[PDB]
């Protein structure tokens, strides 16, 4: 309208909505694990081998997100991975 | 070796890359019927060729290169040497509309840089702003 | 055909003759001519108008030739 | 080609009000920060006035000229580019 | 009768653009660029030059305005407004019966009556003292400029104007454009600008070897015919080998010996040369008791053609025994500043002095240039005719009243167009009142009722408040030739636009 | 040398810009010797002096004086709105506190109560306010004189 060019839906009302819904949708594809259970997920990228994994590290390392709210958490995840072992 | 303007078709446009020698700065003008700007450019080139016979000027009807074209191929000029492009021009915005009298030769001398005859002067440039100029003057006077 | 092209030639001759009609005698208005370039020429002479004018009709062409 | 009305002042007041409403939540220590990203995904956080006004894509030419004039007078004192568009917009609204 | 209507429509459209740009309290226009730019300015000439139209009448009016601005320099805005007003008041009301014959005679009679009224109202003035001229210049220049060093600039400009006049012989010809330029050199105090001889020499003279010092010799400049040519008119010698290069030295020695035997008795110095510089031939040339300079641009050419009077012709040798170089001229290469400067004093064609100013950056250069330009223009417009008229909006009312009285006394048939063209002169006071911000009807009625008593023709409208004030206490005066030229140009434009019949095409 | 370290991101440039602005403010506060209080305690007194103690008696001048004085109270209103309180209650409270006492009353960003900014530690500059006023006047002056906007130009 004055600043953006019909690209993003930001303004004075998306704060209490999209900034939380993005993180909710990002975390919804993760609560299926966390615990000794058999919830294997197949990963298809460039190797073309069809392999199933269980940890969320390899799942997040292959998913490509296009949102700053979702990218603000992968940095903390990588920092925690570099610091201690699990977590 | 050249000082006249002739009409070519398609064979000369291909043979110029082999007939030119010692870096010949050839110029090709796409003429369009029904536009006085093309006539003015031709009248200016008729004198520019006699002023400097060290290069070559040719004219061609805009119907050879890509005949299936709408109304986007605006008439302009194309400078070539041995097969390299030196920033071609398009549209009448670079010329200055129908108020061109002594800017084409200056732009040509600035783009070439080999036959400069003391023509390093700056153009008239568009009108300046009354607020930015006043702000700059106040800043210069305060400091 | 026959009586149509003759009427067309007569109309063209009348149209080309109704141009220098308002310029006969010492008291007359001026006429402006453009060369489809940008320059304009103001003159009120019949000979200068008949000499500097485009033509495309055969009857008008032969009339201008006879006038010259 | 021919225009003899008062729509110029109207659109100028509208652009001034829009520029004042766009930048008005960055005053005081309890303000909200802003982020800018477009080139190859470069996250850049900012909250200053001149830094924001110098790196933005404004679609209005009058607002762009106003921002340029405001930034051209920032090399005099320290930081005075902020808390300026609000008073100008209020004065323009009162004049209108 | 549709071409005249379409012409006056475009004329009024062009005139109704820069109408609100007159007086001290003028508006400001703004032009947007198609790429995404916007420039605000309050100059009518810039808007007229940056505009693009397609009607021949608009282009003719633009060319007429440009010619009027280039010839005079003051009064290139109200002409179009007056022409448009006269057209809209005459042709758009007196052409319902189609009679374009008596209108030309009515316009000529109105122009003659206006000229007679403006000539029978002027007051004489004296040019003996200098304080009155400076006061008039300061009052006429107080428009929209700075006020800090205007007195010294105007005094220097008046001195340069009084010193540049020397071509008097009965016609009073004054040329200051191509006769006096401006020089700039940074460094030093800014309070030292004055007048000097002025020689366009910076870094053109090159002396590799140290020779004698130039005190007060007799320099006689020649021509420029010693470059990379083939001789006089034949191709017997051509610069192609080293043998020809070393024979050129002997040829030049023989030529200078022939010149010395012909007409060399005052021993000249430097000569104009466009091509010819080396490390061996130049040494022999300097040893041949002669010097030569190079690197000549357009400014040096204009200087040697105006001050010295050098011409361009195919005749380097065998000239006049008393052509140029008559008088003792000093040429000491001073080291003041940082570049080589020449002060050619007392030579041929005197009264060609230039200015000498030492400022700082480019802003000072531009401001002193525009100050000198406007002051010289005002001085030339004032000295051209020692007659002043009280402007502001007092002479037009008296002219209109005299025209109305003459029309009522003659009792003619064509009185309607005469009255229409006489009542179309109150546009400037109405525009001034509208720009000031007051009533344009009551003020006009009061001004019309005031200009009809007994001995009252100097009461105008103030351009800063909006009240009627006498011109004898304010100090607003204008020259006489400018108003006459404006009226003549307006009448000629109206006559040219009124004598247009049909428009066709040709080659 | 002011050596700084960060957690390897883009906040280091922000910290550098902040310390540069702080150094600039310190340099500006050391060239002069007069420092006036801030926290929104100068616009209220200015408006009170422009409204009450009028320099002259003229309706035409007052029509502009009132508009210029009513536009200087936007800073405290915006501050109170961004702090999380009301807009008119704090305004009339500060007005009553300034009318009853007579000292420079500031704006508190904690409880919304009128307090004195001359005893806490909030300070400002001197030439900054003058430059801001000059810029605002220059901008507001060369805007209302716009007549018409035409579509032309080629360069
Ligand atoms: N102090 C004043 N009192 C009365 N009239 C004034 C005063 N100052 C300027 N004017 C009027 O304003 C007009 C300005 O004309 P100007 O815009 O200079 O014409 P141009 O654009 O053709 O040079 C003058 O004709 C003059 O009569
Ligand atoms: N410690 C403080 N307490 C209350 N208000 C403050 C304080 N510091 C600054 N302000 C307010 O912030 C405003 C200016 O903030 P800002 O626009 O960010 O510029 P700056 O960063 O130079 O202060 C001032 O009007 C002032 O009232």
Residue numbers in the entry:
A (entry chain H): 14 to 100
B (entry chain Q): 90 to 232
C (entry chain A): 13 to 80
D (entry chain F): 12 to 107
E (entry chain C): 20 to 526
F (entry chain F): 373 to 527
From the article:
The complex between open human TRiC and PhLP2A was generated using purified components and subjected to cryoEM to investigate its structure. We obtained a 3.08 Å resolution consensus map containing PhLP2A-dependent density within the TRiC chamber, positioned close to the equatorial region. The TXD and CTD density allowed the tracing of the backbone based on sidechain densities. Notably, only the apical domains of CCT3 and CCT4 were predicted to form a dimeric complex with H3 of PhLP2A with good prediction scores, in agreement with our cryoEM density maps. Therefore, we built atomic models of the complex between open TRiC and residues 63–232 of PhLP2A (Fig. 1c, d(i)), based on experimental densities as well as predicted CCT3/4 and PhLP2A contacts (Fig. 1d(ii, iii), Supplementary Fig. 3a, b). Overall, PhLP2A binds within the open TRiC chamber in an extended conformation where each of its domains engages distinct subunit-specific sites within the chaperonin. The central PhLP2A TXD domain is encapsulated in the open TRIC chamber where it is constrained through polar and hydrophobic interactions with the equatorial domains of CCT3 and CCT1 (Fig. 2a(iii), b, c, and Supplementary Movie 1). The NTD of PhLP2A can adopt two different orientations, whereby H3 of the NTD contacts the apical regions of either CCT3 or CCT4. While PFD binds primarily to a single site in the apical domain of CCT4, PhLP2A binds in a multivalent manner, with binding sites in both the apical domains of CCT3/4 (which overlaps with that of PFD) and the equatorial domain regions of CCT3/6.
